[PDB]
Amino acid sequence: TRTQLPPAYTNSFTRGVYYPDKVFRSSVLHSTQDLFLPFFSNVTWFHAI
Amino acid sequence: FLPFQQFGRDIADTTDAVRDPQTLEILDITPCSFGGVSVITPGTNTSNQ
Ligand SMILES: *[C@@H]1O[C@H](CO)[C@@H](O)[C@H](O)[C@H]1NC(C)=O
Ligand SMILES: *[C@@H]1O[C@H](CO)[C@@H](O)[C@H](O)[C@H]1NC(C)=O
């Protein structure tokens, strides 16, 4: 009785941000390249309703 | 620091605060051996001072 519906797609909103070092930083702004979530992107939305 | 950080840097991009891994106490770093030696000579013709 497993009914399957087409999956939908939601958007990112400035999320998926984390700390990349044990180096404390404060009152500073710097840039770095690493695998992060792209902002305002379509990702797969799953359900179990 | 945060309870997962160990070293701390500033805008100088230098490690200036470390965490004691026996006490969990932040300890600042302060270098030494600063500056040079200048000499005030009144002239070689007169008394040597
Ligand atoms: C995400 O995909 C759906 C279906 O293709 C589309 O309707 C929607 O506009 C897309 N949204 C974004 C953020 O591109
Ligand atoms: C030093 O002082 C003496 C006495 O005034 C003078 O005769 C001499 O020429 C001086 N030497 C120099 C190079 O200043």
Author numbering:
A (entry chain C): 20 to 68
B (entry chain B): 559 to 607
Task: Paste lines from the article.
The spike glycoproteins of coronaviruses are responsible for receptor binding and membrane fusion during the initial stages of virus infection. The spike proteins of most current severe acute respiratory syndrome coronavirus 2 isolates contain a D614G substitution, by comparison with the spike protein of initial isolates. Viruses that have spike proteins containing the amino acid substitution D614G are currently predominant in the severe acute respiratory syndrome coronavirus 2 (SARS-CoV-2) pandemic, and it has recently been shown that G614 viruses have higher infectivity and produce higher viral loads than D614 viruses. In this study we present high-resolution, single-particle cryo-electron microscopy structures of the G614 spike variant showing that it adopts a predominantly open conformation, unlike the D614 spike that is mostly closed.
Strikingly, the structures we solved show that the G614 spike exists predominantly in the open, receptor-binding-competent conformation, in contrast to the D614 spike; 87% of G614 spikes have either one or two erect RBDs, compared with 17% in our D614 structure [and less than 50% in the structures of D614 reported elsewhere, none of which showed two erect RBDs]. G614 spikes with two erect RBDs account for 20% of observed particles. This conformation has only previously been observed for the furin-cleaved protein on exposure to ACE2 (6), including by tomography on virions. With a glycine residue at position 614 a salt bridge cannot be formed and thus the structures of the G614 spike in the open and closed conformation are very similar to each other in this region and, importantly, similar to the open conformation of the D614 spike. As a consequence of the D614G substitution, a tightly closed structure observed for the D614 spike is not formed and the G614 spike assembly adopts a greater range of more open and flexible conformations than its D614 counterpart. The greater conformational flexibility of the G614 spike explains how it more readily adopts the receptor-binding-competent conformation and suggests how the presently circulating strains of SARS-CoV-2 might have fitness advantage over the D614 variant and display higher infectivity.
